[PDB]
DNA sequence: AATGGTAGGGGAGGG
DNA sequence: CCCTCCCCTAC
């Protein structure tokens, strides 16, 4: 199910039954790069306190 | 600094005898002039531009709504090119609708406010 | 209300007076027409005749060879301030200082024939004995091209960039004298401002034109870019070359100093910058000037044209 | 002001007939007429606020290209090589678009003198002035003198990514959203426009002190029947290439036909008024003056860099090479002749070819 | 901004007078209104049921 | 139809 | 585990 695949609008999403944000996918892919980066300059890993 | 109030409205209604004075009366502020149907309010908008003659003519996406619709409009079902009558002169722009308006009249300029 | 709040049909009103254009081709034409708005005027005033090279002219002529400096920062947190200096208008003041333009390239130092010269897009012939001539009058630069001094011939992009980043400094010197008055007149002052920052770049950028230009020359922005990183280089050393400024360049991107000061009580760390600048600004011609214009007690360098 | 005063709101050409207030004549091919000149519309607005449409007559485009002849023409031999250049370029343009009466084409070729701009030359250099008629094809035409199509070798092309409007306003000091001061016009069929209503609602004291001062009704007045109005709006207008006095407010100089500068800061006009712009705004917010402190400088001996040494070498060697045994002056270097007193400087020539009185 | 108007399916009038005003009101009410029109589309006020 | 350059990094999908 | 394609930010 590639990011392309899924791509709800706005419209979509709050109109549709049962659809939830991809949690999972939004943390990590994100979130976590970035914040990674910029502890990482500064010795600590975010990585670790998600999984928590 | 003349007498147009600087602000109209122009609605369509084939006249039943309650919507024209109902209207009126929840604006109180604006005069609304009424017409028979679109080609009459669009030979009124040229009267009106011609009037005032404005060296801006601007909106929020023209391309696909106010100018650009009622452009489209005219040139598809009643065969008016309204183009050539805006213009301050009485006798396929594909760099213009990526960066700017693709409308182009004689004398006026075009502002693509969303742009 | 939304084109009255950012002052659009003005401001476009008093950039069209300005260069003398027409109100529809601020925003519907590209760059170029500017620069060539100005031009023409200045070149007409003193009997010019400017050249007009062809499509295929253009692609045939040297690439751009000099690029410019970006330092690979050294990514870490720092703690103690780092100071941010910064060439205010760089390539405009390097223009006006070591005199580049089309009317003073003589041709470069090397390979230079008596009947066959290449410039650019264009070619010439020089005189019997204009260089044993000149031999004083002339200004190397680092890409190798012989400029005429100002002895002999004022530029005339020099004149435009003078007269543009006069008017820029006085609105920047006159945004930088309220405090009490909101954003209603800074942000026209600095969006003005602004604005004349980008016709200064885009008459730098007006010249070799690598894809889509008119009038375009290699040697002159190759030149221009060129002696850009030499100066910022010299300034590098300069800086590293105090031992009472125990001072070290972190990153710098083309005209900027981020010098790191280790436990420097920020305080006084603006002293430090102001020297610096000072000292840096009298070994360079006149119209180059170095800002120190701000300082980052705490920051992080993530990398190349990415920090906070 | 004593001046006729338009602003610059939104300019455009299109072609008509030479009318008696077109250029219909030219100096190679005087004998040959015109079929179509180029007329500018500039639609602007009084500085009482009434619109105007003023149509601008005998601003013809031009290019220049490289002399063929000698400097040491008689000034009969010019004539004849204009007329020839004229000609061939006007059969090999008629040839390309598919006894040569009724030019269509090219008006008219001169002799110009010019100092170019790419590259440092400090000597006159002789050019031609193509001057056409349909801008429009002008640069098309280039790309024919410039492929060797129209002669037998390729000539390189001057002054022709200018545009036509460009070079109009550039010729005359003129700029966007500015006043054209033009002391006098030619008016239209009739004045105040009857479109619907509008000769009555917008007209009032001051327009009617505008018209009584610039036109006359007697002498002033174009006739409707040759020169209708095709303006949906007020007023309409026609202008002289010499009526418009916004130029001979021009500085022009000739700093560059000899060492003159080798034995004043404003240049850009249109900052000035920007200057006064900001002087005021910032006077009315209390501030005291503006002032600038020259810092006391002091360059390297020749601000030398990493190859600087061989740079001077290959300069020496050059010097060497570029000399033939004898010693260069700054006064003795440009030769003292060739006068150059009757062949017509760009800001000189322009004012040719307009048509009469 | 100030008045209060009566909306029947079919527009609005101006409930000018006096007896409309001291009397309190909450928008969608219902009422009798009896007047008289005097001067232009306000109407006067007499009665109200 | 008209256009000013260079440099740098990050994410997605197929390999 | 490297390539192109796309986004867009900083000089
Ligand atoms: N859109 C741009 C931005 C910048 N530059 C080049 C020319 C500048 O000389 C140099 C420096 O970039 P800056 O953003 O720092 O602008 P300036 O130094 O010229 O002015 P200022 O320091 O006042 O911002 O980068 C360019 O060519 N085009
Ligand atoms: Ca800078
Ligand atoms: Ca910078």
Redesign the pocket.
């Given at each position: 199910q590639?990011?392309?695949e899924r791509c709800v609008s706005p419209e979509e999403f709050l109109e549709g039954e049962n659809l939830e944000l991809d949690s999972e996918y939004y943390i990590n892919?994100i979130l976590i790069?970035?914040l990674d980066?910029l502890f990482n300059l500064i010795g600590i890993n975010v990585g670790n306190w998600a999984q928590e | 600094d003349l007498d147009i109030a600087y602000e109209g409205i122009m609605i369509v209604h084939k006249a039943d005898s309650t919507f024209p004075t109902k209207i009126q009366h929840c604006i109180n502020e604006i005069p609304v002039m009424f017409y028979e149907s679109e080609f009459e309010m669009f030979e009124a908008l040229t009267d009106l531009v011609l009037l005032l003659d404005p060296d801006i003519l601007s909106g929020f996406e023209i391309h696909n709504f106010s100018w650009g619709y009622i452009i489209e409009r005219c040139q598809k079902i009643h065969q008016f090119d309204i183009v050539r009558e805006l213009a301050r002169v009485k006798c396929?722009?594909?760099?213009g609708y990526?960066h700017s308006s693709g409308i182009m009249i004689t004398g006026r300029h075009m502002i693509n406010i969303w742009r | 209300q939304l084109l009255r709040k950012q002052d659009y049909i003005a401001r476009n009103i008093e950039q069209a007076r300005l260069i003398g254009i027409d109100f529809h081709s601020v925003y519907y034409?590209?760059?170029?027409?500017k620069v060539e708005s100005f031009l023409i005027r200045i070149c007409k005033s003193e009997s010019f005749i400017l050249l007009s090279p062809g499509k295929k002219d253009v692609r045939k002529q040297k690439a751009?060879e000099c690029?410019?400096l970006?330092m690979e920062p050294e990514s870490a947190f720092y703690k103690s301030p780092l100071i941010v200096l910064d060439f205010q208008s760089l390539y405009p003041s390097i223009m006006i200082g070591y005199n580049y333009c089309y009317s003073t390239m003589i041709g470069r130092v090397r390979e230079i024939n008596l009947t066959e010269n290449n410039l650019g897009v264009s070619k010439f012939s020089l005189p019997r004995n204009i260089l044993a001539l000149l031999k004083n009058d002339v200004t190397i630069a680092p890409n190798g091209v012989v400029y005429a001094k100002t002895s002999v011939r004022k530029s005339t992009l020099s004149k435009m960039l003078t007269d543009i980043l006069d008017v820029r400094v006085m609105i920047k010197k006159t945004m930088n004298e309220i405090g009490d008055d909101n954003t209603t007149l800074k942000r026209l002052l600095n969006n003005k401002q602004l604005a004349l920052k980008?016709l200064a770049?885009?008459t730098?950028?007006?010249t070799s034109?690598?894809?889509?230009?008119r009038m375009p020359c290699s040697d002159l922005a190759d030149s221009i870019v060129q002696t850009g990183r030499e100066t910022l280089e010299k300034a590098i050393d300069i800086i590293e070359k105090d031992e009472t400024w125990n001072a070290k360049v972190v990153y710098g991107?083309?005209?900027?100093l981020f010098v790191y000061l280790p436990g420097k009580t920020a305080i006084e760390a603006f002293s430090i910058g102001h020297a610096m600048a000072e000292r840096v600004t009298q070994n360079n011609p006149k119209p180059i000037f170095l800002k120190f214009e701000k300082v980052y007690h705490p920051s992080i360098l993530?990398?190349?044209?990415?920090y906070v | 002001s004593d001046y006729f005063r338009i602003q610059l709101n939104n300019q455009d050409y299109y072609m008509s007939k030479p009318t008696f207030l077109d250029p219909s004549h030219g100096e190679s091919l005087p004998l040959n007429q015109f079929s179509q000149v180029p007329n500018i519309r500039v639609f602007g607005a009084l500085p009482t606020g009434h619109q105007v449409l003023c149509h601008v007559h005998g601003i013809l485009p031009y290019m220049f290209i490289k002399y063929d002849g000698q400097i040491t023409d008689t000034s009969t031999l010019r004539h004849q090589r204009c007329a020839q250049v004229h000609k061939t370029l006007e059969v090999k343009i008629r040839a390309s678009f598919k006894k040569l009466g009724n030019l269509n084409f090219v008006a008219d070729v001169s002799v110009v003198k010019g100092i170019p701009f790419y590259g440092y030359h400090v000597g006159w250099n002789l050019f031609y002035k193509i001057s056409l008629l349909n801008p429009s094809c002008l640069s098309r035409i280039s790309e024919l003198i410039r492929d060797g199509k129209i002669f037998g070798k390729k000539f390189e092309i001057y002054e022709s990514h200018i545009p036509y409007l460009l070079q109009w306003t550039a010729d005359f000091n003129l700029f966007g959203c500015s006043w054209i001061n033009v002391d006098r016009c030619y008016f239209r069929s009739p004045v105040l426009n009857s479109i619907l209503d509008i000769d009555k609602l917008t007209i009032n004291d001051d327009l009617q002190l505008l018209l009584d001062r610039f036109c006359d009704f007697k002498c002033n007045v174009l006739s409707r029947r040759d020169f209708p109005r095709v303006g949906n709006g007020l007023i309409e207008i026609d202008i002289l290439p010499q009526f418009i006095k916004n130029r001979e407010k021009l500085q022009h100089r000739d700093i560059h036909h000899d060492f003159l500068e080798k034995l004043v800061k404003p240049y850009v006009s249109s900052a000035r008024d920007m200057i006064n712009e900001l002087t005021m705004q910032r006077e009315e917010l209390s501030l005291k003056e503006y002032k600038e402190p020259p810092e006391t400088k002091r360059h390297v001996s020749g601000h030398q860099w990493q190859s600087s040494g061989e740079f001077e070498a290959f300069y020496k060697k050059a010097q060497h090479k570029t000399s033939t045994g004898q010693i260069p002056n700054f006064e003795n270097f440009i030769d003292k002749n060739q006068k150059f007193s009757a062949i017509n400087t760009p800001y000189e020539a322009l004012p040719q070819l307009w048509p009469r009185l | 901004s100030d008045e209060i108007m009566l909306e029947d399916e079919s527009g609005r009038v101006l409930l000018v007078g006096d007896f409309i005003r001291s009397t309190p009101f909450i928008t969608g009410v219902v009422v009798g209104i009896l007047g008289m029109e005097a001067e232009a589309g306000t109407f006067q006020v007499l009665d109200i049921c």
């Open positions: 590639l990011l392309r892919k790069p970035p980066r | 396929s722009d594909t760099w990526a | 034409r590209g760059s170029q027409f751009l690029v410019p970006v980008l770049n885009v730098y950028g007006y034109a690598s894809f889509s230009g991107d083309t005209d900027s993530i990398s190349k044209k990415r | - | -």
